[PDB]
Ligand binder design. Structure first.
Ligand SMILES: CC(C)C[C@H](N)C(=O)NS(=O)(=O)OC[C@H]1O[C@@H](n2cnc3c(N)nccc32)[C@H](O)[C@@H]1O
Ligand SMILES: [Mg+2]
Ligand SMILES: [Zn+2]
Length: 866
């Protein structure tokens, strides 16, 4: 054994040993229990940084733990390859997105191999490859013919100067981000998943996920946004019907989640596009101007909660069907057309928004709900005004005194008897818009024929292949300019036709890749039946909280869709979810000649701080999440060249609990490295003093107290680490526990024959307990200690006999006079000592049937019965 730890030498040799043994290349082996551990696959956008590494190290720790416990572990990796990163790199470097992507994949794959993750690379997928995306095209066509996918007009941001559709993220102040031109709202045909048809299933099945973090479930419930409310119709007054047609001339319909407050409605509000709005604005130029301002605004929820709520009165009136009040209709900028009725009732006394709107325009506030003896002031909003759970109705006729639910059901019965309303369930969830006017994405398998319409591509003709010989330049999608792509024949009639040139939302690839990993070379379907039956669902999923809503909801939705197609037999894709904390790092910049800032990478600066290239100073700025945005991503390859993969992995796992943020630290890397040399030094010095022996096992009676204590520490440590990897998933405390075992080891004389056997037992356990964290050094150290294969020796077992301490002899006194002796456990409570002392032979004789006035218990010394 070499004296000094040399990771540059031992880490490649360990990886080759694992690769040759194929321990990470797994089949559907019925002779072993399966374990599927998945980390969220990365965008191949250039280089991974230590943040990504922390994510994948957490997954590798969990995978290697289960591997050591005899599981058949699948831990797959792949590339989430479509999307805007490559399209942007094409506009900057004039290179093809495919070429840029496959280049990044090659570099990133070596980054990962360098870290020694226990990954089944035979299951690698790259989602921009036809052999992958043909199957989401397949599912698209199957759902399109069921109407689950459908085509309909939708709104987009059209930039008239750049001649391109813009995402909302690039529309600032109503204008294009790179053009500054006024953005036009265009209606264009697009494709949608009818995810609203699955809202109830998606919501209710969250209750099955007993091992998900509750905040993620809460975020999904709030996003789906189910409500149980009431449709309510207000009859249009006789004087207010001019210009109104059909049902709009007869009533104004709204939806409310508080029908228990309908007796407190004091006005009604409608969207600018509502037919009552347009009819009252016929002769009113002020309402026309207000309607136009509304249409020229951002309907985004991000802007609307921060939006000043405004309105104008219409001079039209409707009638409350419960109390007969005549309420004026207002046009209001917060009521959105298309979200149900486009009209709402207002109850200022019990809704905070209505209260402020009514305080602005001095509109009436009518209390209809009281909470106990609480004081109600119409000139100040109090949180109890909206309390739905502890109120009763006041000022409500025969509804007075009821709670929320009873009033809700009573209002429903009364409204239904008059034909003026009925219960209704609504969801905030909207259908999922699939179409992207972008090149680097999965083509939509639709052919447009002037005779047949929108026709899906037959399954025998999939994939519709995206051409890779393309360099986009933002002047619109190049697919719409390539007739050798869009010119085709109709699959139904054979006539000339045109391929759809929009591509798919790239969330589609990540909505099912976890099933493709189960059979990534299967060419007859999305996933083979045998492999889906074997692997079931993902046992453990690890990824950032930024994907807790959309990505997870889409993945759950695709799972249910695939189940409904008979492709899988699980309802939910991920059984457990670990959301790792972000790795953060200080940033550095230099003022640009254009007045901007040149963000510099920490690996190219020196520290007052200077750039490592010229010696001129650079500015030290704030510490934030590692990302390419501020160029503060630490490349693991640089850490590995300087210290080794095990150091990188150990620092990430030790610096903080996995869910807590983790600050980059040169000092932390050095501490991790010193511990690895301590571990190496410990085993080297042990083997220098005599060589390897058979580890102690079996009956420890006759071992010295010092060695019994070390075995107690050993098996306590094994129990703790097993619980930290397996239940708590807290790796920093697992490493700290092994450090404590070594500290006790260092303080124990292990030179005797029995001492060397216990030493061997301790070291053989330490190196296996740490193998999930630092497998390279632990693999090498194991092989110097023991001849068996580490993965066949398995996870260390807890010797329960090593955990029992010795019994203690206690004196039994009666009124301070020694009357007997008792033997009790070291863990014996004060009540067990009292029990045992009272039953002592000499005690019961010298008590003379008299009861104990008091019993004094000195733990480990005596019991005095008075
Ligand atoms: C399933 C797909 C939709 C995932 C998608 N391709 C993606 O986000 N791909 S990705 O490549 O963007 O991130 C891959 C994973 O790495 C984490 N991750 C990123 N930055 C990190 C940081 N600073 N600290 C710590 C962790 C960090 C990030 O949460 C994610 O789980
Ligand atoms: Mg269950
Ligand atoms: Zn046709």
């Amino acid at each position: 054994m070499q004296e000094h730890y040399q990771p540059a030498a031992i880490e490649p040799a360990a990886q080759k040993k694992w690769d040759d043994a194929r321990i990470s290349n797994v089949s559907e082996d019925a002779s072993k229990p399966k374990y599927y551990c998945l980390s969220m696959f990365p965008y191949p956008s250039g280089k991974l940084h230590m943040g990504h590494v922390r994510n994948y190290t957490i997954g590798d720790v969990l995978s290697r733990f289960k591997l050591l416990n005899g599981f058949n572990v699948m831990q797959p990796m792949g590339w989430d390859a479509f999307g805007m990163p490559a399209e942007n790199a094409a506009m900057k470097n004039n290179v093809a997105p495919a070429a840029w992507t496959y280049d990044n994949i090659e570099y990133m794959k070596t980054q990962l191999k360098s870290l020694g993750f226990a990954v089944d690379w035979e299951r690698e997928v790259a989602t921009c490859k036809p052999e992958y995306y043909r199957w989401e095209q397949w599912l698209f066509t199957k759902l399109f013919e069921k109407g689950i996918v459908y085509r309909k007009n939708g709104t987009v941001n059209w930039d008239p100067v750049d001649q391109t559709v813009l995402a909302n993220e690039q529309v600032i102040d109503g204008r294009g981000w790179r053009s500054g031109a006024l953005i036009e709202k265009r209606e264009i045909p697009m494709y949608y998943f009818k995810i609203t048809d699955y809202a109830e299933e998606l919501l209710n099945d969250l209750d099955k996920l007993e091992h998900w973090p509750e905040q993620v479930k809460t975020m999904q419930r709030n996003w789906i946004g189910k409500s149980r409310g009431m449709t309510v119709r207000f009859a249009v007054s006789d004087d207010s019907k001019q210009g109104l047609e059909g049902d709009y001339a007869k009533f104004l319909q709204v939806y409310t989640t508080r029908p228990d407050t309908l007796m407190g409605a004091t006005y009604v509000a409608v969207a600018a596009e509502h037919p009552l709005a347009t009819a009252a604005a016929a002769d009113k130029p002020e309402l026309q101007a207000f309607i136009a301002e509304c249409k020229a605004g951002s309907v985004a929820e991000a802007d609307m909660a921060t939006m000043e709520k405004k309105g104008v009165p219409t001079g039209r009136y409707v009638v409350n069907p419960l109390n007969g009040d005549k309420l004026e209709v207002w046009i209001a900028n917060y009521v959105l057309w298309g979200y149900g009725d486009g009209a709402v009732m207002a109850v200022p006394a019990h809704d905070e928004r209505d209260f402020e709107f009514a305080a602005k325009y001095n509109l009436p506030k009518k209390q209809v709900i009281a909470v106990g003896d609480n004081a109600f002031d119409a000139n100040r909003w109090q949180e109890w005004y909206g309390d739905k759970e502890n109120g009763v109705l006041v000022n409500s006729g025969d509804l007075d005194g009821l709670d929320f639910q009873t009033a809700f059901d009573a209002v429903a019965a009364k409204l239904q008897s008059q034909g003026a309303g009925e219960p209704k369930t609504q969801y905030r969830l909207r259908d999922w818009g699939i179409s992207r006017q972008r090149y680097w994405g999965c083509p939509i398998p639709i052919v447009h024929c002037e005779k047949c319409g929108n026709v899906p591509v037959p399954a025998d003709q999939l994939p519709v292949v995206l051409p890779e010989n393309v360099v986009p330049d933002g002047m619109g999608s190049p697919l719409a300019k390539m007739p050798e792509f869009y010119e085709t024949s109709c699959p139904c009639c054979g006539g000339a036709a045109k391929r759809e040139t929009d591509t798919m939302d790239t969330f589609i690839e990540s909505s099912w890749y976890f099933f493709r990993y189960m059979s990534p070379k299967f060419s007859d379907g999305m996933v083979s039946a045998e492999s889906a039956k074997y692997w079931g669902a993902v046992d453990q999923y690890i990824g950032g909280i930024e994907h807790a809503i959309l990505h997870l909801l889409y993945a759950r939705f695709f799972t249910k869709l695939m189940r409904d197609e008979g492709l899988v037999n699980v309802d939910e894709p991920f059984e457990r979810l670990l959301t790792q904390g972000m790795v953060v790092c200080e940033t550095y910049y230099r003022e640009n000649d254009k007045g901007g800032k040149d963000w510099i990478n920490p690996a190219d600066v020196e520290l007052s701080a200077v750039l490592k290239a010229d010696g001129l100073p650079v500015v030290i700025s704030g510490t934030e999440k590692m990302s390419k945005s501020k160029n503060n991503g630490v490349d693991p390859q640089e850490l590995i060249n300087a210290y080794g993969a095990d150091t990188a992995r150990l620092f990430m796992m030790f610096a903080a609990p996995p869910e807590q943020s983790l600050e980059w630290s040169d000092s932390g890397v050095e501490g991790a490295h010193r511990f690895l040399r301590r571990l190496w030094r410990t085993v080297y010095e042990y083997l220098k003093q005599g060589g390897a022996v058979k580890a102690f096992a079996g009956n420890q009676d006759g071992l010295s107290k010092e060695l019994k204590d070390l075995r107690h520490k050993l098996h306590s440590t094994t129990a703790k680490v097993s619980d930290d990897y397996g239940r708590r998933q807290q790796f920093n405390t697992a490493i700290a526990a092994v450090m404590e075992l070594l500290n006790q080891y260092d303080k124990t004389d292990t030179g005797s024959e029995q001492g060397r056997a216990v030493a061997q037992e301790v070291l053989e356990a330490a190196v296996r307990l740490l193998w999930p964290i630092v497998p390279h050094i632990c693999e090498t150290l194991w092989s110097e200690l023991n001849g068996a294969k580490l993965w066949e020796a398995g996870w260390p077992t807890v010797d329960e006999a090593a955990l029992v301490k010795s019994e203690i002899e206690v004196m039994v006194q009666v009124n301070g006079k020694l009357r007997g002796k008792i033997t009790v456990a070291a863990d014996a409570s004060k009540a067990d000592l009292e029990a045992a002392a009272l039953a002592n032979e000499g005690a019961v004789k010298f008590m003379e049937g008299k009861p104990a006035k008091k019993i004094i218990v000195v733990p480990g010394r005596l019991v005095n019965i008075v």
